[PDB]
Amino acid sequence: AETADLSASVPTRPAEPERKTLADYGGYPSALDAVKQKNDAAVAAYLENAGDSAMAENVRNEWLKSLGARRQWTLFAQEYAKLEPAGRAQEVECYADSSRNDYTRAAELVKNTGKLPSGCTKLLEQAAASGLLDGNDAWRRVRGLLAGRQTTDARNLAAALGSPFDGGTQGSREYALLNVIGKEARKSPNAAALLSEMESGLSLEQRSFAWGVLGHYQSQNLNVPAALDYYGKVADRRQLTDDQIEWYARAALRARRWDELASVISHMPEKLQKSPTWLYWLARSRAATGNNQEAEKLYKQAAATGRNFYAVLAGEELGRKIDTRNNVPDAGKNSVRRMAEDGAVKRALVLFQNSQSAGDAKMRRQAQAEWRFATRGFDEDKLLTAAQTAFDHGFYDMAVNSAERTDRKLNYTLRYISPFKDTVIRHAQNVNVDPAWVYGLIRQESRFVIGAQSRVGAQGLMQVMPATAREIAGKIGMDAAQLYTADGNIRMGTWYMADTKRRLQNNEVLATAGYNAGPGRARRWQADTPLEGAVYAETIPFSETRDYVKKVMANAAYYAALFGAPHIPLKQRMGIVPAR
Numbered sequence: 001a002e003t004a005d006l007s008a009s010v011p012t013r014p015a016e017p018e019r020k021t022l023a024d025y026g027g028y029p030s031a032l033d034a035v036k037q038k039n040d041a042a043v044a045a046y047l048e049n050a051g052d053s054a055m056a057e058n059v060r061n062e063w064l065k066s067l068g069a070r071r072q073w074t075l076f077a078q079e080y081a082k083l084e085p086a087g088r089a090q091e092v093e094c095y096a097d098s099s100r101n102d103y104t105r106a107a108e109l110v111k112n113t114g115k116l117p118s119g120c121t122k123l124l125e126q127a128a129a130s131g132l133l134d135g136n137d138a139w140r141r142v143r144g145l146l147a148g149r150q151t152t153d154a155r156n157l158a159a160a161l162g163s164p165f166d167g168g169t170q171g172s173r174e175y176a177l178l179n180v181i182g183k184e185a186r187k188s189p190n191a192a193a194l195l196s197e198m199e200s201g202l203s204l205e206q207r208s209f210a211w212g213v214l215g216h217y218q219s220q221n222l223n224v225p226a227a228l229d230y231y232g233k234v235a236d237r238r239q240l241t242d243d244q245i246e247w248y249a250r251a252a253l254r255a256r257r258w259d260e261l262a263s264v265i266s267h268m269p270e271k272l273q274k275s276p277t278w279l280y281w282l283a284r285s286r287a288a289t290g291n292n293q294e295a296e297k298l299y300k301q302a303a304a305t306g307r308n309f310y311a312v313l314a315g316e317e318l319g320r321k322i323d324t325r326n327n328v329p330d331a332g333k334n335s336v337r338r339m340a341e342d343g344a345v346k347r348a349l350v351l352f353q354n355s356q357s358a359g360d361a362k363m364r365r366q367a368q369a370e371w372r373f374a375t376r377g378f379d380e381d382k383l384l385t386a387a388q389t390a391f392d393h394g395f396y397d398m399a400v401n402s403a404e405r406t407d408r409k410l411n412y413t414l415r416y417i418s419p420f421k422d423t424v425i426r427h428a429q430n431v432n433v434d435p436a437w438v439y440g441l442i443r444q445e446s447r448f449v450i451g452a453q454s455r456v457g458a459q460g461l462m463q464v465m466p467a468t469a470r471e472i473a474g475k476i477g478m479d480a481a482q483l484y485t486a487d488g489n490i491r492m493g494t495w496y497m498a499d500t501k502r503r504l505q506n507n508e509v510l511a512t513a514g515y516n517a518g519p520g521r522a523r524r525w526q527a528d529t530p531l532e533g534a535v536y537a538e539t540i541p542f543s544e545t546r547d548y549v550k551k552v553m554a555n556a557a558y559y560a561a562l563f564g565a566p567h568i569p570l571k572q573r574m575g576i577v578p579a580r
C-alpha cells in the first residue's frame with residue numbers, strides 16, 4: 001500500500017578534526033609494533049587517545065591475540081569488553097572461549113581441514129584432549145593438515161587425540177601415509193600403485209582420503225579420466241576436504257556425468273550444497289536425468305542468492321530476465337551530506353582525500369578499512385545513502401561496496417556504476433568490443449579506481465601490465481607511457497580485450513580468462529572436445545581466474561541490461577568454448 005521511499009536517518013557519531021585523524025594514523029604502525037614487542041603501556045596509551053576507528057579496533061584485536069597467547073586474562077577481559085561484537089577477530093573469539101575452558105566452537109572449527117590461527121588451533125587441541133571432539137572429524141582434520149603440510153599442527157592434534165605420530169597405531173599410520181598424500185608424492189606416476197598395495201592395512205577413512213588426494217591432483221590438473229578413476233575409488237566421499245570434493249564435482253561436470261555429479265554434490269557439507277555454484281549444477285543434473293520438478297525448486301533457490309553468476313543462470317532456466325530498475329529512489333541530497341558528518345564516515349573520507357593529494361597507497365587502504373568499519377552496522381537505507389556519499393567524493397570502490405550489501409532495496413546504478421562513460425564507449429566501439437563486457441571487466445579489475453596498481457605492477461582502470469602496454473602501443477601508434485593516463489589506459493585495455501578475443505577463436509569466455517592469466521593459459525584449459533562456457537569457467541584450475549571469469553561475465557550481464565543493449569541471455573553470452 002506504500003510507494004517506495006528512503007529513510008533520511010543517519011548516524012551522528014562524534015567527529016574529530018582532520019589533524020587528529022592524521023595523527024592517529026601517524027601512530028598506528030607504532031601501536032602495532034608495541035603489541036608485537038609486548039609494550040602494554042604503549043598500546044594502552046594509544047587506545048586511550050585514539051578515536052573509535054578501524055585503527056583502534058585493529059590494534060585492540062592484535063593486542064587481545066597477544067594477551068590471549070600470554071594468558072593475561074584480567075586485561076584480556078577488560079579489553080574484549082570494549083570491542084564491538086561484530087568487530088571481533090576469529091582468533092580473539094577462540095581465546096575468549098578458551099579463557100573459560102569453553103569448547104562450544106570446536107564442533108564447527110574441527111570441520112576446517114587447513115591452517116587456523118594459533119588461538120583456534122589450541123582450542124581444538126584442548127577439546128581433543130578433553131574428549132569433546134567427534135572422532136571422525138578430528139582425524140579428518142589431521143589428514144587434511146598433513147596434506148597441506150601443516151605437519152606440526154597435525155602432530156599436536158594427533159597427540160591430543162591419544163594416538164601420537166611417534167607411538168600411536170592410528171597416529172603413525174596416518175603419518176606414514178605421506179608417501180602417497182605428500183605435496184610431491186601425490187604427483188608421482190606410481191602413487192596409485194603404492195596406494196593400491198597398502199589398501200589392505202588402512203581404514204575405510206584413510207583410503208577414502210588418500211584416493212581423494214590423488215583424484216584432486218589429477219582433476220585440478222585437467223586430467224579428467226585419471227581424476228574420475230581415483231575419485232571413483234573413494235568409498236566415503238564425506239571423508240574428503242571441501243577442495244577435494246569440489247574438484248570431484250568439477251571432474252564429473254567436465255565429463256558430463258550428471259548422475260555422478262549429483263551423487264558427489266549430495267555428499268558435500270550443507271554450506272557447500274547451498275552455495276550458488278552447487279545449487280545450480282545439482283539443478284542442471286536433476287534436469288538432465290529427467291527430474292524437472294526437483295530441478296525447478298533448485299533453480300529457485302539458486303536464483304534467490306542475489307546478484308551473481310549462478311543466480312543469473314538459474315533465473316534464466318526459470319525464464320526470468322535481469323531487471324535493473326531500481327526499486328527505491330535516490331537518497332536526498334541533505335541525507336547524503338549529513339552522512340559525511342558522521343564521525344566514522346568522515347574519518348574514512350579524510351584518509352581518502354589525504355591519500356589522493358599524497359599518492360599514498362597504504363593510507364588509501366586504511367580509508368577503505370575505515371569505510372567498512374564506519375558502515376558495518378548499517379541497515380539498507382543507510383547503506384544506500386552512504387553509497388551515494390562515497391560516489392560524490394570519488395571514493396568509487398566504496399560506493400559499490402556499500403550498494404552491493406543490500407538485499408531487498410536495490411539500487412543497480414550504485415551497484416553497477418559507470419563513470420568515464422564517454423571514454424569507455426568511444427574506445428570500445430573503435431576496436432569493436434561490447435561496452436557491457438568492458439565495464440564488467442573494469443568493475444572486477446579495479447572497481448573504477450584510476451590509480452589502481454596491483455602487486456606485480458598491473459596499472460590503471462584496466463590493470464594493464466607494463467610489458468603488454470609496450471606491445472600494444474607499438475601496434476597502434478601510441479607511446480607506452482600513455483599506460484599511465486586514464487584515456488590511454490582504456491585505449492590499451494579495450495584493444496587487448498579485442499586482440500585476445502580474436503586470437504582465442506572469437507570467444508569472450510576464453511578472452512576474459514586470457515586477459516587475466518594469459519592467452520597461453522586460456523588455451524591450455526581448453527578440452528579436446530567443446531565445452532559449454534559455464535563448464536569451462538567452473539573448471540578453470542587457478543582459483544583467482546575462475547572467480548574472475550564468473551564475476552566479469554555476470555557484471556557484463558547487468559551492464560548490458562542497464563545500458564539497454566539488445567537482450568543476450570547469460571547462457572548464450574557464455575556460449576560454447578571450442579575444442580583445442
Ligand SMILES: CC(=O)N[C@H]1[C@@H]2OC[C@@H](O2)[C@@H](O[C@@H]2O[C@H](CO)[C@@H](O[C@@H]3O[C@H](CO)[C@@H](O)[C@H](O)[C@H]3NC(C)=O)[C@H](O)[C@H]2NC(C)=O)[C@@H]1O
Nearest residue numbers: 454455456458463464465468496515516517518519520521
Ligand atoms: C597479480 C595480477 O595483477 N595478476 C593479473 C592482473 O590481471 C590482468 C593482468 O594483471 C594479468 O596479466 C595478464 O598476465 C599475462 C601473463 O600471465 C599476460 O599475458 C602475456 O602477455 C602476452 C599476451 O599477448 C604474451 O606474450 C605472453 O605469452 C602472455 N602470457 C601467457 C601466460 O600467455 C597478459 O597480457 C596480462 N594482461 C594484461 C591486461 O596486461 C596479471 O597476471
Ligand SMILES: [Zn+2]
Nearest residue numbers: 235236237267
Ligand atoms: Zn554415500
Ligand SMILES: [Zn+2]
Nearest residue numbers: 340341349393
Ligand atoms: Zn565532503
Ligand SMILES: [Zn+2]
Nearest residue numbers: 423426427487
Ligand atoms: Zn579517448
Ligand SMILES: [Zn+2]
Nearest residue numbers: 445454458463
Ligand atoms: Zn587484476
